Write a protein that binds this ligand. Sequence first.
Ligand SMILES: [Mg+2]
Ligand SMILES: [Mg+2]
Ligand SMILES: [Mg+2]
Ligand SMILES: [Mg+2]
Ligand SMILES: [Mg+2]
Ligand SMILES: [Mg+2]
Ligand SMILES: [Mg+2]
Ligand SMILES: [Mg+2]
Ligand SMILES: [Mg+2]
Ligand SMILES: [Mg+2]
Ligand SMILES: [Mg+2]
Ligand SMILES: [Mg+2]
Ligand SMILES: [Mg+2]
Ligand SMILES: [Mg+2]
Ligand SMILES: [Mg+2]
Ligand SMILES: [Mg+2]
Ligand SMILES: [Mg+2]
Ligand SMILES: [Mg+2]
Ligand SMILES: [Mg+2]
Ligand SMILES: [Mg+2]
Ligand SMILES: [Mg+2]
Ligand SMILES: [Mg+2]
Ligand SMILES: [Mg+2]
Ligand SMILES: [Mg+2]
Ligand SMILES: [Mg+2]
Ligand SMILES: [Mg+2]
Ligand SMILES: [Mg+2]
Ligand SMILES: [Mg+2]
Ligand SMILES: [Mg+2]
Ligand SMILES: [Mg+2]
Ligand SMILES: [Mg+2]
Ligand SMILES: [Mg+2]
Ligand SMILES: [Mg+2]
Ligand SMILES: [Mg+2]
Ligand SMILES: [Mg+2]
Lengths: 152, 206, 100
Amino acid sequence: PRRRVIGQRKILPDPKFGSELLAKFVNILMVDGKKSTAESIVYSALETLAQRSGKSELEAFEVALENVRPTVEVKSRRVGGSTYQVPVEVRPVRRNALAMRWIVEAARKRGDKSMALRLANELSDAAENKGTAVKKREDVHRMAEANKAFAH
Amino acid sequence: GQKVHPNGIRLGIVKPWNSTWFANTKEFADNLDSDFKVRQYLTKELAKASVSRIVIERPAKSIRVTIHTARPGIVIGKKGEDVEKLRKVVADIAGVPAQINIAEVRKPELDAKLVADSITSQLERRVMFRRAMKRAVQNAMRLGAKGIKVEVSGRLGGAEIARTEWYREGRVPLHTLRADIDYNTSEAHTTYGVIGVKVWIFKGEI
Amino acid sequence: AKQSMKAREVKRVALADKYFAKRAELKAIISDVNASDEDRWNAVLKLQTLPRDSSPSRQRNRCRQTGRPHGFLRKFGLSRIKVREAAMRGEIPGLKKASW
RNA sequence: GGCCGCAAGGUUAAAACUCAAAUGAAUUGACGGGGGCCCGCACAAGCGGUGGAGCAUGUGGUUUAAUUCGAUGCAACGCGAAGAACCUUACCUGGUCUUGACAUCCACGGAAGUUUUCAGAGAUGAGAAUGUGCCUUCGGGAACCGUGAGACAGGUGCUGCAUGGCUGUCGUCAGCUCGUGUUGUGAAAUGUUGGGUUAAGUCCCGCAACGAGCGCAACCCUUAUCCUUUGUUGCCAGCGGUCCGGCCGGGAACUCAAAGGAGACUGCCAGUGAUAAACUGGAGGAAGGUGGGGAUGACGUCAAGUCAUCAUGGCCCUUACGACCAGGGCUACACACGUGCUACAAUGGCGCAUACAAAGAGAAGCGACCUCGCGAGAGCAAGCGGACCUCAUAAAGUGCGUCGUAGUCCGGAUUGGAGUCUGCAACUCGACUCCAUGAAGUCGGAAUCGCUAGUAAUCGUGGAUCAGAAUGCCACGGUGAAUACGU
Ligand SMILES: [Mg+2]
Ligand SMILES: [Mg+2]
Ligand SMILES: [Mg+2]
Ligand SMILES: [Mg+2]
Ligand SMILES: [Mg+2]
Ligand SMILES: [Mg+2]
Ligand SMILES: [Mg+2]
Ligand SMILES: [Mg+2]
Ligand SMILES: [Mg+2]
Ligand SMILES: [Mg+2]
Ligand SMILES: [Mg+2]
Ligand SMILES: [Mg+2]
Ligand SMILES: [Mg+2]
Ligand SMILES: [Mg+2]
Ligand SMILES: [Mg+2]
Ligand SMILES: [Mg+2]
Ligand SMILES: [Mg+2]
Ligand SMILES: [Mg+2]
Ligand SMILES: [Mg+2]
Ligand SMILES: [Mg+2]
Ligand SMILES: [Mg+2]
Ligand SMILES: [Mg+2]
Ligand SMILES: [Mg+2]
Ligand SMILES: [Mg+2]
Ligand SMILES: [Mg+2]
Ligand SMILES: [Mg+2]
Ligand SMILES: [Mg+2]
Ligand SMILES: [Mg+2]
Ligand SMILES: [Mg+2]
Ligand SMILES: [Mg+2]
Ligand SMILES: [Mg+2]
Ligand SMILES: [Mg+2]
Ligand SMILES: [Mg+2]
Ligand SMILES: [Mg+2]
Ligand SMILES: [Mg+2]
């Protein structure tokens, strides 16, 4: 905004892991204000993935997170009718936000029987670079790679 | 834009109500109907008596009406021969026994209703509106009023196009709630149509 | 409104409160379950005899001053315009602008 | 026409005819695809929708005997209307009235009312018994019924471009003026410009200006913390009894109720600043810099809306443009648009069991308990003019089982049969219940809307209007997000 007055709002930790990042993930996955459903879904998926992997929920989630997060994006800038695609860096908080949002949106578009199974399969795939989320990240990286001539 | 009623916004702060009775839902509409008829009647007869406000109160199964006037002698009559007949007619209208009190208005040029009625009468008698408005403002200000505003709108002077003109002196802070403002209006039926008159009078802070 | 409408309302009120008791008794006869269907038939045929204006449902609420048939409020007996007019002058006891 | 020139042309130089102006400089606004400095869900950053389907509702058009009238870029289209079967009703067809459906004046026969009968769709016409009085100088005055004339009554008929009153919008934008003085022949200017600063013509400093008014802010309501008084129908910490029911005896600690106070003021600390105004941060505290929300709309603009709330000038009709009654219409239907509701499913559908609210209404009213009915409901019938009784089990949530991606155990339009209730009367044209049926619809082209926090999204509850008739309007709580680098 024109004023630049806002600050930052406090977020509560997750119920049974003591982590803020999982709480943010649950919030991203919530619809209509039904938080209990979202937290149960994510807990079930994390448990299934930990069983099928063996490491834990925490660092498995983290490992999937480094494989999807971006490092540079583009912004439009109109000049004379067309637009420059200028590349700019991404702050780490925005990196986490974009990673989680891409993960959730990719998982929502699948043909499994339950949302927990969808999310677990997608995030296990993304842990080793096979899903649609990593494809979106690669596309963003490629598009930012092409237009570096305007990167001042 | 439009402005709020100066009387309505100060009823819980400085101005008091004109009706001070209590009733349930079954009596409320009838009480307002009877009050309307009583006020209309007393306005009808007492026109040449310069009455400002009529306060109606209902103690118990009866009624008490207090009229504020600037000519109490003509209202009272001869040793009270008029108050009794007015009381009897009010008792007939309202269906309960009645009692009537008279309150004298000192300095009748500081009451907005009286000034509005005077201006209306002068307009009816074919007097130039600027003349009357200036006299009203001077008369009000000479008696110690803190401010006065007088507005006249309509088909002034018999013109083909209507307009609005107003005069003001002193302070009239309409946005200050605690301030004491007396506001009242009047209508004049000239040979070309209606002319509206509004008066604001500012007296004191608290 | 027109004076004709006010006259019609007055006449309807008169007929209604004149025939109230007879309407009540005939309706009570009809509404009973333990009776004779012949008596019910007679009561039905008798109920139609009365003038239509004796029904309380034939009356419309109207403003006590102007006669407007829309915007009525039962508490005061006036439509919105007249309620606001009177309320702004302090002629309705205890009523004031709300804010919460 | 003359003179000059190779030519292009140069030079000297008229008239008829036509209009009431054409023109210079400066003043106040408005505008610029001119320049600076700011603001706003205005972009950017995100979430959810509309435009496609079915249905509700308003509008345009067409049709009709009539589909009554008005609003009709933003600022009309769930608008007047907070609720059209009869009434409402203002429109159509038919049947009737003429001082009259509604007031005053004069003359005459007069109680007011209560049952009645025939003809008629009703309006109305005629007839049959009955009380025929009440203060009353026995003169009656008259609550109020019928007849006869006119002076008159009546008009939702026209003109919002003749008007009052009331409302929309720019816009909760920070602006708009005046007295005296001074400057200019004058329209006008200064003040109100300049440097900082603020949400603000907010404040400080300088200044041919010195002062003042309407605006901004404060005074008003509600919410968040604590204190004092009173304890019923409200409360139960410490004690006694219990049928486990604050149920009883009891207590005034606590929640709570409603009256009166304290509290938040850049008040204190540090730094910058022009020692100023102010700005960045910290302590204490329930709350920190306008804590949150509402009320409050300057001078004016749009010949904006309203003669159908009402009032009113002028015009118009008076056996009719006024009045009464029955039936119909405002609900039509090749089509086009606005605002909504319900969906297209597994973050779900269905079955069983179990937690946690707020606010509000009630006497031609709300209606428990018990009995009958699968059901809407019916019968009998306590309590309540209410912190006491009724409305009136909150829903999403939680645990267990099933369905396992199918036009389906998704969706509930249309249609047939049988009923309930309100109301003189549910054909046109009401709501609701039961059984049967089971349509389009698999996320919606070009376009387009709202929102910055207890907000969006989603789930329930109450009220006005009202005999009956909400998916609309106005209110109340549960759960509860994403994002804002920047101009
Ligand atoms: Mg009339
Ligand atoms: Mg009705
Ligand atoms: Mg020549
Ligand atoms: Mg040549
Ligand atoms: Mg010129
Ligand atoms: Mg010029
Ligand atoms: Mg400019
Ligand atoms: Mg400009
Ligand atoms: Mg946007
Ligand atoms: Mg649609
Ligand atoms: Mg229409
Ligand atoms: Mg029109
Ligand atoms: Mg609306
Ligand atoms: Mg009708
Ligand atoms: Mg007007
Ligand atoms: Mg001079
Ligand atoms: Mg200015
Ligand atoms: Mg100036
Ligand atoms: Mg200047
Ligand atoms: Mg300045
Ligand atoms: Mg100021
Ligand atoms: Mg203010
Ligand atoms: Mg602190
Ligand atoms: Mg602090
Ligand atoms: Mg116009
Ligand atoms: Mg207008
Ligand atoms: Mg119009
Ligand atoms: Mg009209
Ligand atoms: Mg009819
Ligand atoms: Mg309609
Ligand atoms: Mg189903
Ligand atoms: Mg499917
Ligand atoms: Mg069925
Ligand atoms: Mg905002
Ligand atoms: Mg809510």
